[PDB]
Amino acid sequence: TLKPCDYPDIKHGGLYHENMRRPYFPVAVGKYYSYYCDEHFETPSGSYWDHIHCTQDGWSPAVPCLRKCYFPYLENGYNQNHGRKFVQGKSIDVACHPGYALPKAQTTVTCMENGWSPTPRCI
Amino acid sequence: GLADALTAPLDHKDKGLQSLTLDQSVRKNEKLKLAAQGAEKTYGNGDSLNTGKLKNDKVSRFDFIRQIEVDGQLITLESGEFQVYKQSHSALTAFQTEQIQDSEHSGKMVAKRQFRIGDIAGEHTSFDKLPEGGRATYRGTAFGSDDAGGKLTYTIDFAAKQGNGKIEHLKSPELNVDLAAADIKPDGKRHAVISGSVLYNQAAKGSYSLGIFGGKAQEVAGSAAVKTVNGIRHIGLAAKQEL
């Protein structure tokens, strides 16, 4: 016998129609529900919404809301990546203008759950 | 009267449902700008939508723009058609996307078509104020992407506190599903809600959620999700009893 799924605790998001869905949990394996992601967070498909599925191994996707970082404009830096979108965990190099640099001798930035780490700024 | 819904304020003389709170239609720090018949208004998570000016038992259509504040500037996320279905004690919203933001570049819009159900609101029927017995038959509309011609039939046995229905006449055959027997349960605020399985050719294709609306349980409103050969499809559901 397969383990039913309890209410999903979608971190950095939640389920749509929460009020109507909640009284019917735990749900059988095979059941799926439309969910959303909060501001700055995206679904594995790149949208703000998708469907979470109750499988044998539990809720799929396991990480329903991943952070999305939009590369900022650098006042005194090269803007080849200006406005580019990056998924949580991906790394990018910051090319600053001569005489400018990322504080405390840094060059690479990474998209974390909190956002860009460190903050991409030249001097 | 689409323009009045955006410009004119709330008036008690207008036909119900008069107001609709945009919660599932607009996320907390995002903006939804609606435009129709020369009119233009921005919302607003928790902001009210003047449904009173719209026509009952019909789909009201508006042009939408969804935006997010990125570095103190409002950047477009998605755009298309915003649909509103009105009834006397209930109303529901839907989004038909035509353009979305590129996966790799923000500020670059790409043509993608997604249909999703927004809000399902109204004068909720209390689970503790439902009729003790009798059978009620609900008749109304079922609507998906590029189709508002579906006809919904739902039946509730108040003694058993159980419901069952059927969807018919939708262009996509896989969407003409059966709404399996499901128990009416109380909500967190103790509102009468129904949720069960969706079947096509006696196979489970998804779930359906309905809310009972009106003092004397006059209406039902909600949505359904159906698995088809080409993907998961959403259907807006709204039905009423004989007036």
Residue numbers in the entry:
A (entry chain A): 321 to 443
B (entry chain D): 80 to 322
Excerpt from the publication:
To determine whether these modifications affect the overall structure of fHbp and thence fH binding, we determined the atomic structure of fHbpDM in complex with fH67. Characterisation of the two Glu residues in V1 fHbp that form salt bridges with fH, and their equivalent residues in V2 and V3 proteins (i.e. Thr304) indicated that these residues make independent contributions to high affinity fH binding and that different variant family proteins engage fH in distinct ways. Taken together, our results show modification of V1 fHbp at Glu283 and/or Glu304 does not affect the structure or immunogenicity of the protein, even though these residues contribute significantly to interactions with fH67. Previous work suggests that the immunogenicity of fHbpDM is impaired compared with V1 fHbp. The non-functional proteins also elicited SBA titres (measured using human complement), that were similar as raised against the wild-type V1 fHbp.
Factor H binding protein (fHbp) is a 27 kDa surface lipoprotein consisting of two β-barrels that promotes resistance against complement mediated lysis and is a key meningococcal antigen that elicits SBAs. Here we characterised members of the three variant families by identifying amino acids that are critical for fH binding and through structural analysis, to inform future vaccine design and to understand the basis of the interaction of fHbp with fH. Here we show that even though V1, 2 and V3 fHbps exhibit remarkably conserved atomic structures, differences in key amino acids necessary for interactions with fH are only revealed by functional studies.
